[PDB]
Design a protein around this ligand. Structure first.
Ligand SMILES: Nc1ncnc2c1ncn2[C@@H]1O[C@H](COP(=O)(O)OP(=O)(O)NP(=O)(O)O)[C@@H](O)[C@H]1O
Ligand SMILES: Nc1ncnc2c1ncn2[C@@H]1O[C@H](COP(=O)(O)OP(=O)(O)NP(=O)(O)O)[C@@H](O)[C@H]1O
Ligand SMILES: Nc1ncnc2c1ncn2[C@@H]1O[C@H](COP(=O)(O)OP(=O)(O)NP(=O)(O)O)[C@@H](O)[C@H]1O
Ligand SMILES: Nc1ncnc2c1ncn2[C@@H]1O[C@H](COP(=O)(O)OP(=O)(O)NP(=O)(O)O)[C@@H](O)[C@H]1O
Ligand SMILES: Nc1ncnc2c1ncn2[C@@H]1O[C@H](COP(=O)(O)OP(=O)(O)NP(=O)(O)O)[C@@H](O)[C@H]1O
Ligand SMILES: [Mg+2]
Ligand SMILES: [Mg+2]
Ligand SMILES: [Mg+2]
Ligand SMILES: [Mg+2]
Ligand SMILES: [Mg+2]
Ligand SMILES: [Mg+2]
Lengths: 476, 469, 475
């Protein structure tokens, strides 16, 4: 007879809550303005009706029912229908535009019975206390409301308000301790960018995932990405795919594995976009779909620079085997980027993917949040059986030294190292398969030349030393 | 939830269309952020562009002061007031006020309203509960009438509470935060849309500037990677370099010349703009290091006369110190001067100068800004960067500015036989073959003379090479 | 359109883009000892002495006698101006003995009004408005608005002094004054390390433009003097001057330029001060005035070390062609240092100048502050067409292992690079004209020897590699 839970239906919340929200109990969902308290509370009710056939009541202390309905239309929720079918009831407790909570408790109970409601949402409880002038019996009244609802036996969501993101959990510093369950929505301003996070602080009598988890409000409501939950569990096969460059495929011991993450690390101009461009060509030639995620160059530039290499991307676009998705890294946050990726993938249903580049997306953002992105993208592709080619521009121009994020290096199956080499007063370029995981790879640091045809991988600088430096020395 | 176009330059992009119609939007900020401007600009555009009358509720600032202050932006509000398009309700010493607004709304058939400042109307004793109940009224009543409102609120802190009483945010359907952050000894204006209930919006802060045209927002995010790209070449002025670039620079490209002090970046800039005026192409030089006088002289020593170019009306030398203004302003200056002169080529000497006393993320927003604006307007951009190490040549514009540039010319010193020789190298050239040689070049009265490469040397990049065998 | 009134305070009219809006009230807030009372007195004083605009100064504490007395330090005979009826100080100080009581400012309004007309005052100053409430209770917003409006009707440009508790905190005390005032100026005395820095910021000028951010100022005998770097043209000529060393002149294509900023960079004891000494010796040899600004060595030592190089500074000090201004960097702030330099240049009217060294002035200061110093000094020298030889000591001993770590390279026109070089188990020296804008320069890392006669630049190290490292190798 332990605390059983009720599915919310919100992508990720049931995972981080190890089931859902405790049944017959109230959950405080606190946050600042614009965190997604109302969306969460509505989505809890909406998913109740549509998925589980559980009617719900929505208590509003300010926002008009008509306004609540119009705001949900963005998500594609016809709340007018649910209202017209007695599946949703919006109790208007908003003041007229022209003391102890007890009457309202009666009105709610009447409604719950009338519409046979199993879920309730109250938004916001902090309002009535201010709207009137309590700020003195907050604990008493919140305790009453919680207790009376426990009697009715309804799963409740209570919206609270905060001022500071990493400050007190609520306004009166009392609502948290009365509530059985506490969830915190945050919208943290880092640099000049916001990040939405959800935390389940407390679930009395049950287990939950601790810490903040990133989420996004899309046209499908709140979508949490259980970064921690996503488990290391894939398929992995010895099936190979080609790079579009034959000598490289020989250097990779037949070609890239289908279930793989490929990284091309090198200085600027080393020729990473060409490797990417050839990898997508190969897909479209083998009658496979692919998506290019550009974060550095426009389509026009990509198309031009490709046609110089002799790769017609438009023909692939027209054929329906290629989709170039161009966007500035600061066009949104890494959280939304990953969603746009995941969404675009689901639509086109690609076999191969390419992000150009990762170093561009790591502009300004913390090394932590970037790690979360990489793992998120890496994991999605390996789970969805999509081969992934990633690019990374090294800051050091000469040779190679290391990788910015140690996470990337260990999260990639294959590492292609492009570098520059000074040979007889000329800037040569060299390619090397540094890592393959599960195959033989050529252990050579081979010269290559970029031409109108593309990459021409030549032989190793055998008669040179200190090639990794970028400034070698010929040894007779 | 449909939206009304504000007409504010960049806001309708950040807000994904504009402000929701019929609803009220809270615009909070400290003094001098630009709340009254936004509110005036909102109404102004309402009537001049969309033929929507507006009512402006003032609580302290006199009607005539509002008209006097607006004149700076070039807004004849009195003309509009006379023509019965704008009404300024003077509430300077809520049911009563609301009744007066409703009357004014109908009297002028107004579709937009601006209330500034609401915090002042509660500046008696009204506290928390009173403010929440009272604001709720105003917002609700305004919603009933059928008018799109902009409501001004005050802050005491830039990254603290959004308003005063910590109540106005939760009541309002829409929240916009205006900030003026003192970063060191320079202020930076920024707009953030925190909340737009019922629809989507661009999140995060975005920089803006109050100009003689009012609030002008330049979103780095809304900037789409959707510029054009051609195979049309343009010359550097140095023919050996054009041959090294496989015909020349591209018309649709950003050029970077990186190197130590005295390596000759400004010479390459001089010859670049010389070629432009030689082909009757208009060009601007945004100089942040030297002065017009010293540039003219040092160019004349190179056999380059900027004075004639300027007289012809093809060259514009804009000199300014990086510390004179913030990077947000500098960008507005660059954009503005470009829009007037309509140049085909542009030059910034140097980017490294503008980086002095600024964050990497701010300088990134700047570079990303200018780069993009040049590419979208089809303007060739020769940028310069001075490396701090004068021989090591370890990195180039070490701030991820390389991924933004299409061409990289690396200038360096080379220690040959106890002499300090120079070298030029086309490091990168997207979409073209480039000479892979680290060619020696010598500056003269005539200019840069690119010679042959150091074949019989090693460790050239180090700056201290070794003669082989 | 909002017209502005020239304050007369040095720099304020530049940062205010004209001055203070006419017929409008300006708030000038700051902590204790920021110069709020100075600014206000200076506003009125200048008003009278420059534009024949009478003024009225309202005090709620300090007696007229004291205000007149304190102003004497700036050389302002306010009693003269009071006697002529050009200035009036309305004493509204609390009665020595009395009792207390809502508060209304209707009484003072009419007292100020009366005096305004009586003295025909164009300018007015209130100091400090905070005190008048800090003597009873806080109505502030309403009472502030009342005064601003009444004074607006009268059409007098007013300065309202207000007091703060923290430097980077609330603009005023009660969190209201700011919003009610049309114009806001924040004076700050920021404590960094253990040194104070005075800064002016115009936060807001309704209906007008202004320079944003903080700008440094100093309070002297002249009063408040603000130094906007953004306000700053420098002309250029192909006229050569000599370094004092004939070989270096050759290496610099026939000498330094008259319109140039020379920088000498190197490790300690590489010989920057010798080149400085020779540079100045030439000016005096060509009957030209020069000033040496030293921040490392005393006058006595400089002279001793100079005479050991065969340079008599005393004769040129006596002949009135040389002024040696010695002072520690920590004696003042860079804001002050710069004003000492500008002032000393204005007096002597030199043709050449020298700072020995810039590296010393950078000690224990903000990188931003030191930048603003160099941009200022270098700008003023180029402005007045004064040739400037600056010194910089690199912390790295051997060779030019790294460059100048201060981002000065872009300002300096000529860069002389002194370095050490180990040759056959012995520390040698070297000179190189690294940069020379507008001239050919010898591109050679020439050996150079110091002696009793002074510098002897010699031949290059042609038979050596890795010279710049400081540890070469014989080919
Ligand atoms: N269709 C949509 N797509 C993307 N984002 C959306 C969409 N609809 C709403 N949003 C976002 O969700 C916000 C509304 O969240 P909401 O749940 O109303 O916040 P809240 O925390 O309840 N606000 P408050 O009542 O002031 O405390 C909007 O301001 C947008 O940022
Ligand atoms: N048509 C061409 N012929 C020969 N070489 C070319 C051609 N186009 C490009 N290149 C070479 O390839 C480089 C650009 O390759 P690219 O794949 O864009 O590299 P990258 O590492 O992705 N560059 P970046 O994004 O700026 O860091 C140029 O600098 C040239 O060296
Ligand atoms: N008349 C001339 N004859 C020969 N060389 C000259 C002449 N004028 C200038 N130079 C050379 O040009 C160099 C300066 O070139 P410039 O274009 O100013 O380089 P830069 O790297 O842009 N300098 P900076 O802005 O100080 O970092 C000098 O160091 C000289 O070697
Ligand atoms: N013509 C103009 N050109 C440029 N900037 C201007 C112009 N007019 C006003 N400004 C700027 O805008 C500021 C005034 O903006 P405004 O909207 O009146 O401030 P506010 O934030 O409403 N002040 P407050 O009511 O006290 O909280 C001035 O201080 C200037 O910085
Ligand atoms: N009579 C002399 N004969 C030879 N060499 C001398 C003589 N007097 C001084 N020197 C040299 O000159 C050096 C000091 O030169 P100076 O111009 O003071 O250099 P600096 O770089 O300015 N030194 P510092 O201020 O400590 O960083 C000494 O270390 C000696 O090597
Ligand atoms: Mg809400
Ligand atoms: Mg690339
Ligand atoms: Mg205002
Ligand atoms: Mg230059
Ligand atoms: Mg005082
Ligand atoms: Mg010395």
């Amino acid at each position: 007879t332990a605390v059983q839970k009720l599915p919310t239906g919100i992508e990720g919340f049931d995972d981080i809550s190890h089931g859902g929200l405790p049944i017959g109990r109230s959950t405080l969902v606190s946050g600042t303005s614009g965190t997604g308290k109302t969306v969460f509370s509505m989505q809890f009710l909406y998913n109740g009706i549509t998925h589980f056939d559980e009617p719900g009541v929505f208590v509003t202390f300010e926002e008009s029912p008509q306004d609540i309905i119009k705001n949900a239309a963005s998500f594609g929720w016809d709340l007018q229908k649910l209202v017209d079918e007695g599946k949703l009831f919006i109790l208007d407790a908003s003041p007229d535009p022209e003391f102890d909570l007890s009457a309202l408790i009666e009105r709610i109970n009447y409604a719950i019975r009338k519409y046979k409601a199993k879920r309730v949402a109250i938004d916001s409880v902090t309002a009535v206390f201010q709207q009137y002038d309590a700020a003195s019996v907050v604990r008493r009244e919140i305790f009453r409301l919680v207790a009376r609802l426990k009697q009715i036996g309804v799963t409740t969501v209570m919206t609270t308000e905060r001022i500071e993101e990493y400050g007190p959990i609520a306004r009166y510093g009392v609502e948290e301790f009365v509530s059985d369950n506490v969830v915190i929505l945050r919208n943290v301003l880092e640099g000049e960018r916001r990040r939405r996070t959800v935390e389940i602080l407390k679930l009395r009598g049950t287990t939950h995932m601790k810490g903040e988890y990133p989420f996004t409000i899309t046209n499908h409501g709140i979508s949490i990405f259980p970064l921690g939950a996503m488990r290391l569990t894939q398929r992995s096969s010895n099936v190979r795919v080609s790079s579009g460059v034959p000598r490289l495929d020989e250097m990779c011991g037949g070609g890239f594995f289908k279930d793989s993450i490929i990284l091309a690390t090198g200085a600027t101009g080393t020729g990473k976009t060409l490797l990417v461009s050839k990898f997508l060509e190969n897909a479209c030639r083998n009658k496979e779909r692919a998506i290019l995620f550009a974060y550095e160059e426009s389509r026009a530039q990509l198309l031009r620079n490709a046609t110089s290499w002799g790769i017609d991307f438009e023909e692939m676009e027209r054929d329906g085997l290629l989709k170039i998705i161009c966007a500035y890294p600061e066009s949104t946050g890494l959280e939304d980027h990953l969603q746009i990726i995941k969404s675009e993938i689901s639509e086109f249903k690609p076999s191969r993917i390419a992000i150009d580049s990762l170093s561009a997306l790591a502009r300004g953002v913390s090394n932590n949040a970037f790690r979360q992105f990489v793992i998120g993208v890496t994991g999605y592709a390996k789970q969805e059986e999509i081969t992934g080619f990633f690019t990374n521009t090294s800051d050091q121009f000469m040779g190679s030294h290391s990788i910015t994020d140690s996470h990337i290096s260990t999260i990639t199956d294959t590492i292609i190292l492009l570098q520059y080499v000074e040979i007889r007063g000329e800037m040569s370029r060299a390619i090397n398969v540094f890592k393959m995981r599960g195959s033989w790879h050529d252990k050579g640091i081979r010269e290559f030349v970029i031409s109108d045809k593309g990459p021409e991988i030549k032989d190793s600088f055998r008669n040179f030393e200190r090639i990794i430096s970028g400034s070698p020395t010929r040894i007779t």
